[PDB]
PDB file of C-alpha atoms in Angstrom:
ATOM      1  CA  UNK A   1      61.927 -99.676-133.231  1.00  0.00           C
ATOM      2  CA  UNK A   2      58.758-101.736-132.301  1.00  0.00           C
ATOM      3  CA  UNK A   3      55.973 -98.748-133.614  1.00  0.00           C
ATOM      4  CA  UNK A   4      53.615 -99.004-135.901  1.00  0.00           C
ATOM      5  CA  UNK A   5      55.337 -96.521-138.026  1.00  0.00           C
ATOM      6  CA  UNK A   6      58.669 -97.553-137.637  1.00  0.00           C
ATOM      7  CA  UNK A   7      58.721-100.747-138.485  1.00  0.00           C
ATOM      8  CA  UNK A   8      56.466-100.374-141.400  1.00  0.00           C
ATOM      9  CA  UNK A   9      59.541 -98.128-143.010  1.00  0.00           C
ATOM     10  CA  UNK A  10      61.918-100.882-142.389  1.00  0.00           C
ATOM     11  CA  UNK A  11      59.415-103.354-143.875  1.00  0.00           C
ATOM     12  CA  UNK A  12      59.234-101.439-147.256  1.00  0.00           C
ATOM     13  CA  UNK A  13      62.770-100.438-147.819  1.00  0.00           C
ATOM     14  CA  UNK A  14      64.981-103.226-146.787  1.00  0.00           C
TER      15      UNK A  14
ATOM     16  CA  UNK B   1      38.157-149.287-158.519  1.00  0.00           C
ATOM     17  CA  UNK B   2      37.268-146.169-159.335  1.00  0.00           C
ATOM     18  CA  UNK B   3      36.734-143.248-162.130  1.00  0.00           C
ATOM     19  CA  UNK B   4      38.516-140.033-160.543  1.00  0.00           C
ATOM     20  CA  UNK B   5      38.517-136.724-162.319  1.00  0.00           C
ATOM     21  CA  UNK B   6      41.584-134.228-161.701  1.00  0.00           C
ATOM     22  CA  UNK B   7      41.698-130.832-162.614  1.00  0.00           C
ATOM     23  CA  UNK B   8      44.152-127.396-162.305  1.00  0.00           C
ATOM     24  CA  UNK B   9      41.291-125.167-163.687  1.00  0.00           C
ATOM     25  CA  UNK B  10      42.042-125.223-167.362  1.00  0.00           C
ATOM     26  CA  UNK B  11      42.343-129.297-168.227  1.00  0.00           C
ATOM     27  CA  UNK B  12      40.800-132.069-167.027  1.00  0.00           C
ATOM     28  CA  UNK B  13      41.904-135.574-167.146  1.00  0.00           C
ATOM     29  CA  UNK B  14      39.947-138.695-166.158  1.00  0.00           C
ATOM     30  CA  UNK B  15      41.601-141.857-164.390  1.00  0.00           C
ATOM     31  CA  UNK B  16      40.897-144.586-163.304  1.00  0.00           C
ATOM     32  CA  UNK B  17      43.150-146.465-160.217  1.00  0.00           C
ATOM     33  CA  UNK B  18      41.991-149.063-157.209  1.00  0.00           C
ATOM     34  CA  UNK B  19      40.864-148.085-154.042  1.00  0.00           C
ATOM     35  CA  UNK B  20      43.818-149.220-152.660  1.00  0.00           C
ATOM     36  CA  UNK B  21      46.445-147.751-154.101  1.00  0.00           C
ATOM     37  CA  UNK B  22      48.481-144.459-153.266  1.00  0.00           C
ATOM     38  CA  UNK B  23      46.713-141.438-154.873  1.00  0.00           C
ATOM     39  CA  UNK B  24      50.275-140.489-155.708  1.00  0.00           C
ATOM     40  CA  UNK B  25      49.934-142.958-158.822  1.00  0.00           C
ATOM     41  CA  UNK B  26      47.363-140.384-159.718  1.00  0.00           C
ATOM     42  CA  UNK B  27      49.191-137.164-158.499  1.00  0.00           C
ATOM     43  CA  UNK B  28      52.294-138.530-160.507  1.00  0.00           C
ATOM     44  CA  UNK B  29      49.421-139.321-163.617  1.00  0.00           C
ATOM     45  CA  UNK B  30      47.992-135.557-163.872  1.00  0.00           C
ATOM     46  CA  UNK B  31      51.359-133.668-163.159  1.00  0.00           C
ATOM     47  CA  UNK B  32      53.288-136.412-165.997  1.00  0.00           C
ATOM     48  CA  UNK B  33      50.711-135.046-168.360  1.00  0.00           C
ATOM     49  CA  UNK B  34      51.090-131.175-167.323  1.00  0.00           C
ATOM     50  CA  UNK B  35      55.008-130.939-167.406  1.00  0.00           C
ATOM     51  CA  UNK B  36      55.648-130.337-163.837  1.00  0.00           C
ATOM     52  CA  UNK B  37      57.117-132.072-160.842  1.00  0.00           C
ATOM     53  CA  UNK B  38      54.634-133.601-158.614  1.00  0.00           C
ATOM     54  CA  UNK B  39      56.412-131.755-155.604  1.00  0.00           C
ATOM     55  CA  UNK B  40      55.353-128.592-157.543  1.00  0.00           C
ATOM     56  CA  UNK B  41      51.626-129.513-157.311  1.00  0.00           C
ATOM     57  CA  UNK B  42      49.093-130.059-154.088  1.00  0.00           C
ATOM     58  CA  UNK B  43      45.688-131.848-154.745  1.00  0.00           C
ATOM     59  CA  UNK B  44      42.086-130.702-152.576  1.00  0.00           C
ATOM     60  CA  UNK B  45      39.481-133.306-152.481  1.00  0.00           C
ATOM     61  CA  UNK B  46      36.507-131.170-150.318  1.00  0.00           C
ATOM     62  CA  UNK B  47      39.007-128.661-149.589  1.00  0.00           C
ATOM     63  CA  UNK B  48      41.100-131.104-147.890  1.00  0.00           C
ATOM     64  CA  UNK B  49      45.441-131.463-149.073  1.00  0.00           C
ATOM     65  CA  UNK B  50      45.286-135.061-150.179  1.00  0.00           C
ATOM     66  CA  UNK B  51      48.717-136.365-149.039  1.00  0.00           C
ATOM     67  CA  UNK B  52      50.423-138.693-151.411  1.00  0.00           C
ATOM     68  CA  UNK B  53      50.413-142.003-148.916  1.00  0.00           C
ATOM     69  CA  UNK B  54      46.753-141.470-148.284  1.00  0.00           C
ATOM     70  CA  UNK B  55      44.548-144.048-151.113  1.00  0.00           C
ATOM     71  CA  UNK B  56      40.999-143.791-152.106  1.00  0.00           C
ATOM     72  CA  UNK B  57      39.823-145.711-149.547  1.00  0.00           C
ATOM     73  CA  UNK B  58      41.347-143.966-146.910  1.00  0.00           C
ATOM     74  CA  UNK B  59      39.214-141.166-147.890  1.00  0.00           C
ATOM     75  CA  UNK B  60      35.465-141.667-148.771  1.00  0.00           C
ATOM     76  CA  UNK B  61      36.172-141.502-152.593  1.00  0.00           C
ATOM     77  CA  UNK B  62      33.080-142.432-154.515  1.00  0.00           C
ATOM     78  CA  UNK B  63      33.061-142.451-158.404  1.00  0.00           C
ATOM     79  CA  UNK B  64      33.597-139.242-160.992  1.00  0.00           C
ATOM     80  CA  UNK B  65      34.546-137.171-157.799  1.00  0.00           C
ATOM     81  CA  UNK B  66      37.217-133.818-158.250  1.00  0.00           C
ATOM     82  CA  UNK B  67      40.051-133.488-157.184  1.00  0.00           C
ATOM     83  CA  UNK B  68      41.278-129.835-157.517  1.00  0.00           C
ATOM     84  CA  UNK B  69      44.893-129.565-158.562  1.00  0.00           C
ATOM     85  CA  UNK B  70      46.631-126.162-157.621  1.00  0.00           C
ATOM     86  CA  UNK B  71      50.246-124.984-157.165  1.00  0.00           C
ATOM     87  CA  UNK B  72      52.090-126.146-153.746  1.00  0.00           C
ATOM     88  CA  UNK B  73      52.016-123.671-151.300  1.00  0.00           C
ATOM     89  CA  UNK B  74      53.673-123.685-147.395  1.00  0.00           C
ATOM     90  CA  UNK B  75      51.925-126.440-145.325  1.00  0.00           C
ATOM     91  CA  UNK B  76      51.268-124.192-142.113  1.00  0.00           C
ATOM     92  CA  UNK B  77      49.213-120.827-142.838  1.00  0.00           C
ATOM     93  CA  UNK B  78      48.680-118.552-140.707  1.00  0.00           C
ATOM     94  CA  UNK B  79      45.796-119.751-137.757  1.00  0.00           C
ATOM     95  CA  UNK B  80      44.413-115.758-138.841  1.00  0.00           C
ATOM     96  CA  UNK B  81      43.439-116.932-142.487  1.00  0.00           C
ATOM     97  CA  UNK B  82      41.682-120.150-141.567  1.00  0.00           C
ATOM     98  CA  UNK B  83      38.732-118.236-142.730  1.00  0.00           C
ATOM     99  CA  UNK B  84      38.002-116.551-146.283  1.00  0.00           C
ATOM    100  CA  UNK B  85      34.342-115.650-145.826  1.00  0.00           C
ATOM    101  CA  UNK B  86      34.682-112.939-142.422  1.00  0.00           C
ATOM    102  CA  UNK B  87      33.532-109.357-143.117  1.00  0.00           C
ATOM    103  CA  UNK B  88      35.695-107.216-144.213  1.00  0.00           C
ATOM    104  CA  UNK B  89      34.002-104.476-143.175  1.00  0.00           C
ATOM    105  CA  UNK B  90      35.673-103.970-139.762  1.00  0.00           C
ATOM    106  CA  UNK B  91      38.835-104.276-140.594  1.00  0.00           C
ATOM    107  CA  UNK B  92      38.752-101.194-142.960  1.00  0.00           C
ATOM    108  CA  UNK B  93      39.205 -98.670-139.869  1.00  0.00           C
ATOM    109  CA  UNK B  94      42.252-100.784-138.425  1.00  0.00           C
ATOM    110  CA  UNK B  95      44.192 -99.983-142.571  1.00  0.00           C
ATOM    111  CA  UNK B  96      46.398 -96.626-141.917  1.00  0.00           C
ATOM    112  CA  UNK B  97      48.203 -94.356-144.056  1.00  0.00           C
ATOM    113  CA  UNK B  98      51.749 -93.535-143.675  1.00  0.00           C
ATOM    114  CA  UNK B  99      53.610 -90.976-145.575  1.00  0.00           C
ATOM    115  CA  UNK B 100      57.851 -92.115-146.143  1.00  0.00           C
ATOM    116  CA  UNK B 101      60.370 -90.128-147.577  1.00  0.00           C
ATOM    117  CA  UNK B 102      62.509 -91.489-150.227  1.00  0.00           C
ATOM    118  CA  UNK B 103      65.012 -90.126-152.604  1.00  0.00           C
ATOM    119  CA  UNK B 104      62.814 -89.067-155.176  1.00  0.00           C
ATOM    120  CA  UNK B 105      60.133 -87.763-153.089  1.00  0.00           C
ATOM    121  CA  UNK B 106      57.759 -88.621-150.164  1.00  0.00           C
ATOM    122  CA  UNK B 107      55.093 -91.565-151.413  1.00  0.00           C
ATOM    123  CA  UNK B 108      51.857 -92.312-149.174  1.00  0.00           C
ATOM    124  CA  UNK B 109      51.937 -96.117-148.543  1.00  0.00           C
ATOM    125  CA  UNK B 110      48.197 -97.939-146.158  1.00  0.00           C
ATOM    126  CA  UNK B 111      49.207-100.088-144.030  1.00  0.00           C
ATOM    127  CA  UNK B 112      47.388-102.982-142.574  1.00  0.00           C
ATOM    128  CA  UNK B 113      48.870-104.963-139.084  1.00  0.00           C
ATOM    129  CA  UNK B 114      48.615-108.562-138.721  1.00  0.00           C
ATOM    130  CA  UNK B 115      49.349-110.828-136.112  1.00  0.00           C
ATOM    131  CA  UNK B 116      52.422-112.767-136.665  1.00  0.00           C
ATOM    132  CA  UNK B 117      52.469-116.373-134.408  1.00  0.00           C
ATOM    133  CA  UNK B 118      56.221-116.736-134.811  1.00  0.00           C
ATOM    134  CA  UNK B 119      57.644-113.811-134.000  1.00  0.00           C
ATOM    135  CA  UNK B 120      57.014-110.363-131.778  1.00  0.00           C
ATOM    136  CA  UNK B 121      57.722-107.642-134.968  1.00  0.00           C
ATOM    137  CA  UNK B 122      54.874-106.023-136.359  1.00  0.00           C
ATOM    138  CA  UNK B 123      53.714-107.477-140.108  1.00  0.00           C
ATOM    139  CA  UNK B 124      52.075-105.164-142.715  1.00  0.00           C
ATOM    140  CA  UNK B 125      50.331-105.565-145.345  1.00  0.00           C
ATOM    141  CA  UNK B 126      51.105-102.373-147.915  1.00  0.00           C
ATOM    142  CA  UNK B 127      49.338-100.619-150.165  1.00  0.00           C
ATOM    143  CA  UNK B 128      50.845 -97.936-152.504  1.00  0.00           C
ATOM    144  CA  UNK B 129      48.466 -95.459-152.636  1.00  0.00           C
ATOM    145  CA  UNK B 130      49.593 -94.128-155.771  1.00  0.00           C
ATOM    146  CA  UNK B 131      48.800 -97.134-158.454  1.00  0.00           C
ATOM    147  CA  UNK B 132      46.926 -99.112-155.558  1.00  0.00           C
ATOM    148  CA  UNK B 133      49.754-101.752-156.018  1.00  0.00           C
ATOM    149  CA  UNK B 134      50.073-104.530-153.361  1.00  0.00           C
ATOM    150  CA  UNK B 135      53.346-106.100-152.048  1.00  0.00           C
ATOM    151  CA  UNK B 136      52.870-109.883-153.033  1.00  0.00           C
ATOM    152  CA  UNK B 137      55.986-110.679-150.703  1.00  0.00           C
ATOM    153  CA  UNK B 138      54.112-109.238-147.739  1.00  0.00           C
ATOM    154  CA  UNK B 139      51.435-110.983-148.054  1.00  0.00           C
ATOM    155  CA  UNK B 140      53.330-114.422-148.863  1.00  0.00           C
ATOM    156  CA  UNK B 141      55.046-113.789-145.474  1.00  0.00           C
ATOM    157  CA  UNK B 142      52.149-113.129-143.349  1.00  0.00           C
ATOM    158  CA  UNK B 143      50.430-115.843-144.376  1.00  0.00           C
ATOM    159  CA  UNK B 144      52.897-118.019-144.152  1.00  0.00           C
ATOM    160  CA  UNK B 145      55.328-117.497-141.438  1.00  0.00           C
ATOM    161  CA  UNK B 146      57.346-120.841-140.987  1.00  0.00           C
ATOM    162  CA  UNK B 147      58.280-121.440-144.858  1.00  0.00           C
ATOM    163  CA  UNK B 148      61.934-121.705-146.127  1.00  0.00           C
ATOM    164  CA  UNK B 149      63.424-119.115-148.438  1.00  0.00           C
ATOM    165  CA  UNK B 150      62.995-121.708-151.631  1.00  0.00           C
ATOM    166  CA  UNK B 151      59.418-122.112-150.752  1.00  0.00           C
ATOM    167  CA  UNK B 152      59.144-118.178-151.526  1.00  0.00           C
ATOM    168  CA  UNK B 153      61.605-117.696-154.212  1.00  0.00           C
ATOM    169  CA  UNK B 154      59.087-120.259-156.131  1.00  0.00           C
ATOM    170  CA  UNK B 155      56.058-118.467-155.329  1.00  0.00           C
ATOM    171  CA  UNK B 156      57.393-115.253-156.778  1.00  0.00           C
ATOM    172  CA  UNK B 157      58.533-116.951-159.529  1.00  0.00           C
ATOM    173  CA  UNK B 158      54.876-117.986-159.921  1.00  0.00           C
ATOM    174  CA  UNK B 159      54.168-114.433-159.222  1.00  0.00           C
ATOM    175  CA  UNK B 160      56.068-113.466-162.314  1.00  0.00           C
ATOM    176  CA  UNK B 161      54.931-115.771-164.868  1.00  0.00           C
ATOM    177  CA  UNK B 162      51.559-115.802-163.774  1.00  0.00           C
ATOM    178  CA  UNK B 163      50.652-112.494-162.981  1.00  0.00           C
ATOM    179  CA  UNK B 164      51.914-108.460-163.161  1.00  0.00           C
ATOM    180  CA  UNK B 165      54.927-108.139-161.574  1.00  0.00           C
ATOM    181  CA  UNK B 166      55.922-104.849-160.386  1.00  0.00           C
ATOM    182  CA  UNK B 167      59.476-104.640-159.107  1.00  0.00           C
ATOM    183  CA  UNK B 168      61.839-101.464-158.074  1.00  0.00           C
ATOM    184  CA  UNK B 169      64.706-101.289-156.181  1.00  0.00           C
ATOM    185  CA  UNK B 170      63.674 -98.097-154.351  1.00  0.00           C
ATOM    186  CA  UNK B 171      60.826-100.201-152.713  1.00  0.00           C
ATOM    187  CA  UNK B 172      61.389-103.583-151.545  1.00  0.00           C
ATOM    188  CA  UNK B 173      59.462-107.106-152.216  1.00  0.00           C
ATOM    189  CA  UNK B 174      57.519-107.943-155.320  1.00  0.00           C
ATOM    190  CA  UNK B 175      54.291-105.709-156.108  1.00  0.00           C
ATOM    191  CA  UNK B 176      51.140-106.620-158.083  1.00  0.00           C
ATOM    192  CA  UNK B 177      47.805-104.464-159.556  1.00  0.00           C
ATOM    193  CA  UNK B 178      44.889-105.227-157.158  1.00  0.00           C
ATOM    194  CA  UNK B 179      42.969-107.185-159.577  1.00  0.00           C
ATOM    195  CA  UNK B 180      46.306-110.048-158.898  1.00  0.00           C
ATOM    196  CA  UNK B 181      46.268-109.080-155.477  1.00  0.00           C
ATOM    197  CA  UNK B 182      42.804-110.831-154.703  1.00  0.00           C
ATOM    198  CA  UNK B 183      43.288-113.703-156.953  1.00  0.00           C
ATOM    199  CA  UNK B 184      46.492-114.247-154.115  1.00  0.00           C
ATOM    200  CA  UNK B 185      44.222-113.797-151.373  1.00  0.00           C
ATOM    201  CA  UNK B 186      42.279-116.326-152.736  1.00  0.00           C
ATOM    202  CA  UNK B 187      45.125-118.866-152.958  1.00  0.00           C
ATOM    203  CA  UNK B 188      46.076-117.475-149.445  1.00  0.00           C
ATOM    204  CA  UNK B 189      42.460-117.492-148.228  1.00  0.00           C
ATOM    205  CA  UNK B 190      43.580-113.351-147.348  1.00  0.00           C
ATOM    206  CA  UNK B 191      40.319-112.135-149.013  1.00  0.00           C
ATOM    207  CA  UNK B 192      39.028-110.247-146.292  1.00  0.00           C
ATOM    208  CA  UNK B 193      42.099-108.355-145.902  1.00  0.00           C
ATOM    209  CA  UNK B 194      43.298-107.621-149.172  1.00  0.00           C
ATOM    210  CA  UNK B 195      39.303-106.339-149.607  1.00  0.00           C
ATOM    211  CA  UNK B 196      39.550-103.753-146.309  1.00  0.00           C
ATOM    212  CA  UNK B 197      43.344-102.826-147.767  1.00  0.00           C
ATOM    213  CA  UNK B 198      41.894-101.403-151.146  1.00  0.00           C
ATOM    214  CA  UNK B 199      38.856 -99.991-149.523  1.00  0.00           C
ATOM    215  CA  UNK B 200      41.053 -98.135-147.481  1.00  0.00           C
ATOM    216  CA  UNK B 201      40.940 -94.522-147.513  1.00  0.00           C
ATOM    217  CA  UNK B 202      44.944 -93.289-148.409  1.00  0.00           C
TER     218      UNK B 202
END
């Protein structure tokens, strides 16, 4: 929920 | 009194007001003549936000000085940005590239981390490796953290008239060619960072 990756996806599609 | 010179870039107008009176006479005089609000405005005298109570006095104002007018943007930027001129050399390295799955496909975005002061999620700045497009809504938010919802609708309303807007509803925010996405971090003072994003290997 608090990676890198993660929250980079959530960034870009909501 | 004094001759003062006011410009956005493209027109200059010359004025001419006392040393004690609010430079807002002349921030109303130059934005009366340009079509737009005063509130939609912010005036640099040596890099400096003139505020509208301040006079000519109050600064050290001598005669046929500039006064730089440019769009308003969110009064507190980001402590990270308070410098436009560090290398942006190391900070190439720190860019990564993420693959993400969507409907249509997986896309390959570059991803950049920034410290945020206001809150303890992780803010990116993105880079679509396919067209090299940049998310101008990323780095509005990262560079200014505190500023109201209005204060960004505007901007991206700038962002639209004044640039290449590139906007689908598969991918969120508003997204512009890299060519508009350093003349932003100039306004932002974000050119180290949008530099290292392009450079960055996808």
């Amino acid at each position: 929920p608090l990676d890198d990756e993660e929250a980079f996806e959530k960034q870009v599609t909501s | 009194h004094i001759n003062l010179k006011v410009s956005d870039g493209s027109s200059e107008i010359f004025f001419k007001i006392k040393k004690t009176t609010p430079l807002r006479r002349l921030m109303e005089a130059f934005a009366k003549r340009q079509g737009k609000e005063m509130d939609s405005l912010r005036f640099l005298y040596d890099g400096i936000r003139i505020e509208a109570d301040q006079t000519p006095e109050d600064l050290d104002m001598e005669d046929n000085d500039i006064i730089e007018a440019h769009r308003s943007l969110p009064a507190e930027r980001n402590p990270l940005y308070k410098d436009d001129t560090l290398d942006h050399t190391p900070l190439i390295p720190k860019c990564r590239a993420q693959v993400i799955e969507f409907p249509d496909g997986p896309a390959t975005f570059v991803r950049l981390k920034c410290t945020n002061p206001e809150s303890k999620v992780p803010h990116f700045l993105m880079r679509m490796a396919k067209d090299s497009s940049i998310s101008a809504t990323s780095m509005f938010r990262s560079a200014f953290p505190k500023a109201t919802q209005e204060e960004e609708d505007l901007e991206m309303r700038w962002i639209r008239d004044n640039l290449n807007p590139i906007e689908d509803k598969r991918v969120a925010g508003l997204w512009v060619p890299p060519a508009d996405a350093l003349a932003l971090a100039k306004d932002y003072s974000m050119t180290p960072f949008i530099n290292a994003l392009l450079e960055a290997s996808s």
